[PDB]
Amino acid sequence: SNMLLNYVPVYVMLPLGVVNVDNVFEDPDGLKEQLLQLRAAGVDGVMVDVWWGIIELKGPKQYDWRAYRSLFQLVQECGLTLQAIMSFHQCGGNVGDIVNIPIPQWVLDIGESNHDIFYTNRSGTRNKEYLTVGVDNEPIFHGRTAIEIYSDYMKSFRENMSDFLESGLIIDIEVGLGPAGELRYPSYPQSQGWEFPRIGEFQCYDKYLKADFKAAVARAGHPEWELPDDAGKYNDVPESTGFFKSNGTYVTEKGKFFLTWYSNKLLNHGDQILDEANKAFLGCKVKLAIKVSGIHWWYKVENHAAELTAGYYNLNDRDGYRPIARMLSRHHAILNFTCLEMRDSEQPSDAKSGPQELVQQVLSGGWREDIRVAGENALPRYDATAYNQIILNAKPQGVNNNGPPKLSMFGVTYLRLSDDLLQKSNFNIFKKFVLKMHADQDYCANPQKYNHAITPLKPSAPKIPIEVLLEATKPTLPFPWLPETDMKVD
Ligand SMILES: OC[C@H]1O[C@H](O[C@H]2[C@H](O)[C@@H](O)[C@@H](O[C@H]3[C@H](O)[C@@H](O)[C@@H](O[C@H]4[C@H](O)[C@@H](O)[C@H](O)O[C@@H]4CO)O[C@@H]3CO)O[C@@H]2CO)[C@H](O)[C@@H](O)[C@@H]1O
DSSP: OOGGGGOOOEEEEOOTTSBOTTSOBOOHHHHHHHHHHHHHHTOOEEEEEEEHHHHTOSSTTOOOOHHHHHHHHHHHHTTOEEEEEEEOSOBSSSTTOOSOBOSOHHHHHHHHHOGGGEEEOTTOOEEEEEEOGGGTTOOOBTTBOHHHHHHHHHHHHHHHTHHHHHTTOEEEEEEOOSGGGBSSOOOSOGGGTOOTTOOOOOOOOSHHHHHHHHHHHHHHTOTTOOSOSSSOOTTOOGGGSTTTSTTSGGGSHHHHHHHHHHHHHHHHHHHHHHHHHHHHHTTSSOEEEEEEOOOOTTTTSTTOTTHHHHTOOOBTTBOSSHHHHHHHHTTTOEEEESOOSOOGGGSOGGGOOOHHHHHHHHHHHHHHHTOEEEEEOSSOOOSHHHHHHHHHHHSTTOOOTTSSOSSOOSEEEESOOOHHHHSHHHHHHHHHHHHHHTTTOOOOSOGGGGTOOOOOOOOOOOOOOHHHHHHTTSOOOOOOOOSSOSSOOO
């Protein structure tokens, strides 16, 4: 078999706010010159937020798809494909967020009077960037539940963009499932202080989550159990907490029970919404995808504090990612792992960071459950170092000169298309990165040639029970990585 079978596509994220809060496509001409640059570089496609808070701004079911229609048209004129994010979250409080885009005002209005629709920490701070899982199924939004809102939105998108869907412009629909569009709790909000190598806080204090928790413990036989109260604050270190120190609460029954409850709320949140997405896009030539954050800090300590916290119940003896991957399998979805570039040695020692290990764990789990795996770089990088790291992760065992590689990622979405990137020296490097992702081949317009043809979305396979999902917590050894890519940028 051909080298082309080694190709991994590359996408570029568009700038935040290319459609402003006013639902206006501000600078088509500018963008256009940029896109044309990417097309000549050999880039396969681009990724864009489809902000819920811009589209359904006016009131319920008052969608205005016009400015996005224009943008998609321009992308299509430029010969690029497109990855569309159903962004049901706010833009603004996270790293890199240069523009503020909130959720719909009319939703915000409701929260003015029912504060418990937001994620809440133990101190009672309400985070407005995303609606809490606790209201997925509460019909308090003018008669709709939150899941109905998301679902209606995706249906509308589907019907209103059907021409672009059928012309094959859109290749994947990333379903936003939490803050920054990631399936996670907002445990590390910059907007509340949080600073890097801090552990973050559990976000289950809104009333619906607290009531669910309380009923559940009571059924377990411990009505008396409460939500954690010894876990510290955003910027603690684990050892400084009752919850996470050795022999702390996290390894008690109560803690295990809690952690399981907490992490399972995510799994079910993701499963239910993907169900809705599957039905909305049924028949379309697209794949669905979700985003999983890379919480590499504290990875190297037994407690994995930041991971727990974000709702990833990952320990050294409990795989907290593989169950997500298994969940994705019934929906035929892709796991988009949002941190691919970092090296362990670039982290402060005191953060006990294990980014490379975390990567191998996550991709291996996906590959093992037989799903497709994609990823992004978490932070803006322009150096060969970062690029060669992404290339290694893309094809962990190198290129197969006589067939398809044994392990390969399904795609990688580079972080942001800025002025800096297009600078002459930066862009020259990038061009190389693109070439080596492409395995030394020229850009290949027909994906069928590299074994990526998209077939019409089928219906989801049947619900897998939580027990079965949870079997995937059994630790496995990762697949073997090369120490260095065989296809470096230098
Ligand atoms: O336009 C698409 C979306 O883009 C933005 O969200 C993306 C994040 O910016 C990107 O970093 C990533 O998400 C998480 C990373 O996996 C995780 O490592 C972390 O980044 C850390 C970093 O590891 C650490 O060293 C540094 O010092 O602190 C950072 C922590 O904040 O958190 C990231 C976010 O949870 O992928 C996201 C989605 O593509 C926009 O904010 C989002 O609104 C857009 O939808």
